Amino acid sequence: ESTSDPLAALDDAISQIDKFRSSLGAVQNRLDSAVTNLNNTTTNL
Amino acid sequence: ANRFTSNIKGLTQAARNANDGISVAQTTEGALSEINNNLQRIRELTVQASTGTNSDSDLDSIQDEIKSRLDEIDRVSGQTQFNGVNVLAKDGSMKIQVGANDGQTITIDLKKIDSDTLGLNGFNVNGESTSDPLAALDDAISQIDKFRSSLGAVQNRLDSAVTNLNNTTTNL
Amino acid sequence: TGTNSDSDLDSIQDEIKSRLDEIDRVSGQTQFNGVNVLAKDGSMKIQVGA
Amino acid sequence: TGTNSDSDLDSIQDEIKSRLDEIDRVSGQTQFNGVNVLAKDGSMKIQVGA
Amino acid sequence: NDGQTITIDLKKIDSDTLGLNGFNVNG
Amino acid sequence: QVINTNSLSLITQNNINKNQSALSSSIERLSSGLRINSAKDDAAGQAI
Amino acid sequence: SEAQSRIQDADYATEVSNMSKAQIIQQAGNSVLAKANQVPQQVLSLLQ
Amino acid sequence: SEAQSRIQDADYATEVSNMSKAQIIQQAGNSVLAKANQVPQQVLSLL
Amino acid sequence: SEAQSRIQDADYATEVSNMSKAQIIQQAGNSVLAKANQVPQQVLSLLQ
Numbered sequence: 238e239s240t241s242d243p244l245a246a247l248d249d250a251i252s253q254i255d256k257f258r259s260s261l262g263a264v265q266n267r268l269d270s271a272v273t274n275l276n277n278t279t280t281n282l
Numbered sequence: 283a284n285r286f287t288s289n290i291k292g293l294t295q296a297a298r299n300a301n302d303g304i305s306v307a308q309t310t311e312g313a314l315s316e317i318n319n320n321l322q323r324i325r326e327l328t329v330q331a332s333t334g335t336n337s338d339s340d341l342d343s344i345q346d347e348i349k350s351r352l353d354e355i356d357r358v359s360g361q362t363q364f365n366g367v368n369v370l371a372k373d374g375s376m377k378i379q380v381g382a383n384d385g386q387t388i389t390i391d392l393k394k395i396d397s398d399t400l401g402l403n404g405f406n407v408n409g410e411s412t413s414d415p416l417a418a419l420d421d422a423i424s425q426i427d428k429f430r431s432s433l434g435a436v437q438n439r440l441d442s443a444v445t446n447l448n449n450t451t452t453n454l
Numbered sequence: 455t456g457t458n459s460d461s462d463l464d465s466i467q468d469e470i471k472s473r474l475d476e477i478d479r480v481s482g483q484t485q486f487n488g489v490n491v492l493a494k495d496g497s498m499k500i501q502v503g504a
Numbered sequence: 505t506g507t508n509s510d511s512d513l514d515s516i517q518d519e520i521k522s523r524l525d526e527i528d529r530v531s532g533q534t535q536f537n538g539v540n541v542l543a544k545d546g547s548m549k550i551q552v553g554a
Numbered sequence: 555n556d557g558q559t560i561t562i563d564l565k566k567i568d569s570d571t572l573g574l575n576g577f578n579v580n581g
Numbered sequence: 582q583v584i585n586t587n588s589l590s591l592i593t594q595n596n597i598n599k600n601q602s603a604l605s606s607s608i609e610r611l612s613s614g615l616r617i618n619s620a621k622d623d624a625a626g627q628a629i
Numbered sequence: 630s631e632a633q634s635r636i637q638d639a640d641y642a643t644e645v646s647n648m649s650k651a652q653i654i655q656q657a658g659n660s661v662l663a664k665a666n667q668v669p670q671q672v673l674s675l676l677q
Numbered sequence: 678s679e680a681q682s683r684i685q686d687a688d689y690a691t692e693v694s695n696m697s698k699a700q701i702i703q704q705a706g707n708s709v710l711a712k713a714n715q716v717p718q719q720v721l722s723l724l
Numbered sequence: 725s726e727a728q729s730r731i732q733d734a735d736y737a738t739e740v741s742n743m744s745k746a747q748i749i750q751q752a753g754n755s756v757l758a759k760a761n762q763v764p765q766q767v768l769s770l771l772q
Contacts (some may be wrong), residue, residue, distance in 0.1 A: 241379035242384050242385075243384070244292075244383060245384050248288075251284065251288065255284055268500075268502070271502045275502070275504070285537070285538075298683065298684075299455045299457065301680075301683050302455070302457045302458055302684075303455075305679055305680040306457055306682070308619070311620060311621075315496065330626055341601060365457065365458070365459055365462075365680075366459040366460075366461070367457075367459055375456075376456045377455070378455050378456060378457060379455045379456075380603075381533045382699065383533075384531070386533045387455075387456075388529075404517075417471040423509065424628075427511075427515075427628040428515075429618055430620045430624065430627060431515045431518055431519070431624035431625070431627065431628065432518055433620065434519075434619070434620025434621055434624030434627070435518065435519045435522035435523070435620075435624055436522070437621045438522075438621055439522055439523075439526045441602070442526060442530075443526075443530075445599070445678060446530055446534075448595050448598065449595065450534070451590045451591075452592060452595055474571075483555070483567070485560045508629070511628060512625060512629055513627060515624060515625045515628055516625045518624075519624055519625060582672070583669075583672075583700070584642065584669045584672050584698060584701045584702060584705070585702075587666065587668075587669060587694060587698070588651050589665040589668065589696050590662060590665055590666055592692070593658060593661055593665055594662065594690055594691075596658055597655065597658040597659070597662065597690075598657060600651060600654045600655050601655070603651050604648065604651035604652065606650050607644055607647045607648035608648060610639055610644050610664040611641070611644055611645070611648060611674070614638065614639075614641075615637050615638060615639065616636070616638060616639035617637065621665055626636055626637075629636055662690065666693065666694060666697055667696070669697065669701060670697075670701070671707065672701065673701060673703070673704055673708075676705055676708045676709065677706055689752070696756070701758075703763070704766075706767040707770070711769060711770055711771070711772075712725070714770070
């Protein structure tokens with residue numbers, strides 16, 4: 238019937254979403270750093 | 283920031299719920315005050331019928347008025363409700379989510395009040411007669427006072443709750 | 455809370471079901487460049503080292 | 505005071521007990537960022553020196 | 555894209571649908 | 582220095598809401614003419 | 630009756646000053662709130 | 678009536694604060710966009 | 725007569741409160757409407 242601990246489950250889902258977003262956030266930072274490094278390397282080459 | 287905003291919204295909702303509980307408690311207190319006034323009137327009527335100078339027809343009239351007062355007590359006890367849930371006909375508890383998180387609540391003890399629970403059913407001053415009328419009436423009045431006092435502190439508790447909750451939302 | 459009635463719970467449950475349906479919907483039918491992202495457990499590999 | 509009767513003392517005691525359990529409640533249930541500020545004897549440090 | 559829609563449920567609201575089809579109080 | 586939150590209106594509103602209860606209690610006690618209108622004021626004095 | 634009136638029947642001379650003080654505090658709170666809602670307006674001056 | 682007012686009514690202080698906040702954000706956004714929408718002229722200023 | 729007056733005549737208190745409420749609502753609405761007319765003004769500054 239009714240969920241046992243609804244607020245706990247909702248917090249767990251929000252935590253999963255936040256973890257996914259955090260894991261996604263660093264990847265584009267890595268990609269931007271790679272873009273800058275590739276630009277510098279292309280200039281020097 | 284996500285955790286903070288979740289906490290803030292939960293705290294605001296909990297404050298709203300505590301205000302709703304305050305309203306419920308105030309309504310129940312009004313009903314109890316009405317029942318108390320009726321009990322005081324019926325006690326004065328019993329004091330009147332206690333003496334021996336009155337004739338038999340006087341006892342009959344006093345008993346008719348007493349029975350009318352008892353019926354009114356039972357009626358206001360049974361028909362009182364707030365937002366579709368009765369207050370004075372069920373012995374359950376009212377749990378109010380005030381902590382903005384799972385589990386923690388505040389309970390309101392609701393007791394079924396009627397002519398039977400208070401006793402002195404079939405009071406019958408006319409006939410037979412109750413053994414100790416004024417004693418039973420004082421017992422019922424004391425029960426009403428106990429219920430009002432146990433309900434009286436609840437709204438003070440909830441006001442403290444809403445004040446602390448507002449402070450917590452401000453700081454968060 | 456306990457102060458609300460049964461029909462109140464009905465309305466709140468209807469709204470919660472609507473929001474959950476929307477959650478599943480947006481989880482289903484959002485894609486980039488013709489490939490879905492929130493429905494496939496794999497990982498995209500992007501060549502950046504030339 | 506000595507002018508009140510027994511039932512008055514019981515009512516005052518009910519009010520006192522309600523206040524006391526409310527004290528315990530607000531103490532145990534007040535938390536910040538997932539830690540209980542009024543439920544532990546520990547200490548937290550604020551890295552201020554860089 | 556085809557199949558990516560949101561459905562809006564509707565109902566036929568009338569006195570007959572509501573009930574009593576001529577509710578009265580004067581007998 | 583930030584516009585997303587005033588950071589002062591909140592404290593002012595909390596103070597106003599705190600004063601509102603005292604104002605309402607005073608206004609009610611003027612018209613009622615009685616010290617303890619409900620058990621919220623003094624549940625101990627109600628029985629007395 | 631005298632005893633109950635000692636218990637009940639809050640004195641008016643106290644409550645009138647109480648409500649007057651409450652009104653003054655509420656007016657001051659409204660004034661300082663209207664004042665406080667104006668400090669984020671200067672942030673616009675930083676732009677242009 | 679008190680309960681319904683708690684539910685449906687809006688305390689005007691919060692709404693005035695929200696109006697002022699949103700108006701300031703709108704004006705700031707318009708002002709910053711007035712400059713943001715114009716930085717392609719640099720390549721024009723090149724020639 | 726009292727039963728008839730129970731219907732026709734109006735409680736002056738609720739009516740004056742409704743009058744005050746309507747006055748304040750109209751003033752607030754007219755103010756926010758006046759403030760809402762300058763919203764489309766930024767476009768001419770954008771054209772500059």
